[PDB]
Design a protein around this ligand. Structure first.
Ligand code: FMN
Length: 144
């Protein structure tokens, strides 16, 4: 699966299609693949929960579940794992992408990887970056 132009955008993100069973990944950026160590072929058609592992806070995962079910945005931080089992902190932002009648068509997920739970200035700057990134991908996804 050769990268589309969308997938060559130099940010970590995935797009899922909630019409397909278990809301699977249909697009994943090259940066996301570099971060997580998976090939595109390995993760297309899978739900993103494969990134979770033993030290992932399950209460935080439920916050994400609730946002998806209520079709709203959420921003959380949680521990995720690469294919080889390397841990990273993920400052994660979810938002729905809506069509011209306001119905949700896709979900966008943006990941900012780090080595620690961030707070205060680092958190603020991280959230600035991931929200701007989500906006750019929302525009890009409009014509998919
Ligand atoms: C667009 C999108 C991106 C997601 N990205 C991540 C991610 O980076 N890390 C993660 O742990 N979960 C991610 N998730 C959340 C899981 O896919 C799943 O929704 C979560 O585990 C809650 O559902 P579950 O209880 O059925 O597992 C993402 C979900 C969506 C829709």
């Amino acid at each position: 699966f050769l990268a589309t132009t969308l997938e060559r955008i130099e940010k970590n993100f995935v797009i899922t299609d909630p019409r397909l069973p278990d809301n699977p990944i249909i697009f994943a950026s090259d940066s996301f693949l570099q971060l997580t160590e998976y090939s595109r072929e390995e993760i297309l058609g899978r739900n993103c929960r494969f990134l979770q592992g033993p030290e992932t806070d399950r209460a935080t995962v439920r916050k994400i579940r609730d946002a998806i079910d209520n079709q709203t945005e959420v921003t959380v931080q949680l521990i995720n794992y690469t294919k080889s089992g390397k841990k990273f902190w993920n400052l994660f932002h979810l938002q729905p992408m809506r069509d011209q009648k306001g119905d949700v068509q896709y979900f966008i997920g943006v990941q900012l990887d780090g080595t620690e739970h961030v707070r205060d200035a680092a958190e603020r700057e991280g959230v600035m970056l991931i929200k701007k990134t989500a906006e750019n991908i929302d525009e890009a996804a409009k014509e998919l």
